[PDB]
C-alpha cells in the first residue's frame, strides 16, 4: 500500500511539518480529531500513504516528531491540529543543541537517536509496502540539521533499499538565527549528497523575497514563510496523495528526476502566491518565473535537467499542454536537449483550499549551484580564520571534517557546472 513515514525534526522541521499536516489533513477531510467528514472518495482512495487507520476508524498521521528540547513540540501539541498525532510519536530530549551541528550529530543527538529509531521501526513494521521516508528539517540549526542527517544515516542503514526524501530549509543572512548557519549547512549538505535520493531545497532568502517583493508583507514572520512552504509541500505531494492517470510514488519520481545520483536537489515553484482564478496561461508563466521559485537561484543562469509540473483544479488539459509546450518552445535555451522529453505535466481535479487553480513545479536545475556557492563563500569567509570553530571542536570535531565538507560541496558545484555546459 505504498506507505510513507514522515519525520520532522528541530524547530523549523516541526513548525513546517505541523503546517504541512494542517493543510493536507484539511484536503483529505480529516478534522483535528482524526475524524473524517469529507464528501468524496478521491480523498480517501490513497489516504493511507500518509495516514494510519484507527480502532474507531480514525486517521492518524504516520508522523514522528523529534526535537532535542521540548518547546516547539509543546507548541505543536497545543496548536490547532496538535491532538491528531500519535502521542507515543513525540520523541524529545531536554538540553537542546545550541544551533550546533556537532551536538545534533555526535553528542546530544546520539543519545536520542535510538528512541527515534524505535518509533520509526514501530511505524515501518506495520506497513503493507513502505515506500520510504520523508524528513522535514532546516540545515542551519543543530537538531534538524545534525541530528536530522544522523537519523538519515541510521535509517539508510536499517532500510537501505527504501527511498529517502527531504524537505530541507537552507539558511540565509536575510533571515538568520546565528552566524554559524553556513557551517551547519555545509556539513549537512555533505550528508544529503550521499544519503538522500530527493531533496527539495527551500531557501529562506527566496521565501523572504516572495513575502516582501510580491505578497507585499513588509515585516514577514516565520508563519508567512511557512505558508509558502506549506503550499509548496502540499503541491509537491499531490500526485502521491491522490489517484490519477499516473501512479506516483517516490521511487519512480527519483528514477525520472535524477539522471546523476548526486544531482538530486530540486528547486520547487508555486503559483499563485483572490477571487479571480488564474488562467492556465498565467499559471504557466508565473510557475516558471524566477519570482515563483523557492530556492533563490535564477533558472536562466542554468539549465533544466528535468521538470515535473502539476496543475490543480478543473481546467483544460489541452490548454495546459499547449501552454507547457509553448513555454518550452519559447525558452529552449534553458532546457537540456540531451534528455528527450524532460518536462512532464499532470493534472489533479481537487484544488487546494482557497484557489480554484494552482500549479506546482519541481525542477532539477543546474542553477541550484548558485545556492551552494552562496553557502560555500560564507563558510569559507569564516573558516579561513577558523572563526567560531571552538563550538564544534569542543564537541569532538576536527578541522579536517570541515575541510572535507567544504571540498565535497565545491565538487558538487563543479558537477552542476559541468552539466550546464554540455
Amino acid at each position: 500500500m505504498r506507505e510513507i513515514v514522515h519525520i520532522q525534526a528541530g524547530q523549523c522541521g516541526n513548525q513546517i511539518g505541523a503546517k504541512f499536516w494542517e493543510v493536507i489533513s484539511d484536503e483529505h477531510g480529516i478534522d483535528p480529531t482524526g475524524s473524517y467528514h469529507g464528501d468524496s472518495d478521491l480523498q480517501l482512495e490513497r489516504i493511507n500513504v500518509y495516514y494510519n487507520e484507527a480502532t474507531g476508524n480514525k486517521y492518524v498521521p504516520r508522523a514522528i516528531l523529534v526535537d532535542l528540547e521540548p518547546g516547539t513540540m509543546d507548541s505543536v501539541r497545543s496548536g490547532p491540529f496538535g491532538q491528531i498525532f500519535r502521542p507515543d510519536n513525540f520523541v524529545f530530549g531536554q538540553s537542546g543543541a545550541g544551533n550546533n551541528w556537532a551536538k545534533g550529530h555526535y553528542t546530544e543527538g546520539a543519545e536520542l537517536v535510538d528512541s527515534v529509531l524505535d518509533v520509526v521501526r514501530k511505524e515501518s513494521e506495520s506497513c503493507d509496502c513502505l515506500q520510504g521516508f520523508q524528513l522535514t528539517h532546516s540545515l542551519g540549526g543543530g537538531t534538524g540539521s545534525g541530528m536530522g542527517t544522523l537519523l538519515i544515516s541510521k535509517i539508510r542503514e536499517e532500510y537501505p533499499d527504501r527511498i529517502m526524501n527531504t524537505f530541507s530549509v537552507m539558511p540565509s543572512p536575510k533571515v538568520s538565527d546565528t552566524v554559524v548557519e553556513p557551517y551547519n549547512a555545509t556539513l549537512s549538505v555533505h550528508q544529503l549528497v550521499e544519503n538522500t535520493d530527493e531533496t527539495y531545497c527551500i531557501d529562506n532568502e527566496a521565501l523572504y523575497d516572495i513575502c516582501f517583493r510580491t505578497l507585499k508583507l513588509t515585516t514577514p514572520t516565520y508563519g508567512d514563510l511557512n505558508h509558502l512552504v506549506s503550499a509548496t509541500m502540499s503541491g509537491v505531494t499531490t500526485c502521491l496523495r491522490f489517484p490519477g492517470q499516473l501512479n506516483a510514488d517516490l521511487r519512480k519520481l527519483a528514477v525520472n528526476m535524477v539522471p546523476f545520483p548526486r544531482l538530486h536537489f530540486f528547486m520547487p515553484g508555486f503559483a499563485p502566491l483572490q477571487y479571480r482564478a488564474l488562467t492556465v496561461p498565467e499559471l504557466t508563466q508565473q510557475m516558471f518565473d524566477s519570482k515563483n521559485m523557492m530556492a533563490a537561484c535564477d533558472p536562466r543562469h542554468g539549465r533544466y535537467l528535468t521538470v515535473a509540473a502539476i496543475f490543480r483544479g478543473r481546467m483544460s488539459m489541452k490548454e495546459v499542454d499547449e501552454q507547457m509546450l509553448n513555454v518550452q518552445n519559447k525558452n529552449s535555451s534553458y532546457f537540456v536537449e540531451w534528455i528527450p522529453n524532460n518536462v512532464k505535466t499532470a493534472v489533479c481535479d481537487i484544488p487546494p483550499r482557497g484557489l480554484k487553480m494552482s500549479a506546482t513545479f519541481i525542477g532539477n536545475s543546474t542553477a541550484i549551484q548558485e545556492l551552494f556557492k552562496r553557502i560555500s563563500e560564507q563558510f569559507t569567509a569564516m573558516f579561513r580564520r577558523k572563526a567560531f570553530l571552538h563550538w564544534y571542536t569542543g564537541e569532538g570535531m576536527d578541522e579536517m571534517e570541515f575541510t572535507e565538507a567544504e571540498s565535497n560541496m565545491n565538487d558538487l558545484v563543479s558537477e552542476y557546472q559541468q552539466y550546464q555546459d554540455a
Binding site: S153, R156, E157, P160
Partner: protein, 53 residues
C-alpha cells in the same frame, strides 16, 4: 492480375491475388547471468554497509 488459392466457407473467404512474381540460450546460461547480477548488487550493498560502519 491473377487470383489464386480461393477458399470459401459460411463465415467468409480467403484468396491470394498476384500482380508480378520475383526476379538458443539454455537455462543454465540464463541462471549464470541472473546470478552474476545478484552478486553485483550484494557487493554494492556490502560496500555500503562497510562505509556505514
Amino acid at each position: 492480375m491473377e487470383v489464386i488459392e480461393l477458399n470459401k466457407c459460411t463465415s467468409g473467404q480467403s484468396f491470394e491475388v498476384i500482380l508480378k512474381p520475383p526476379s538458443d540460450p539454455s537455462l543454465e546460461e540464463i541462471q549464470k547471468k541472473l546470478e552474476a547480477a545478484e552478486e553485483r548488487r550484494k557487493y554494492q550493498e556490502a560496500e555500503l554497509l562497510k562505509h556505514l560502519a
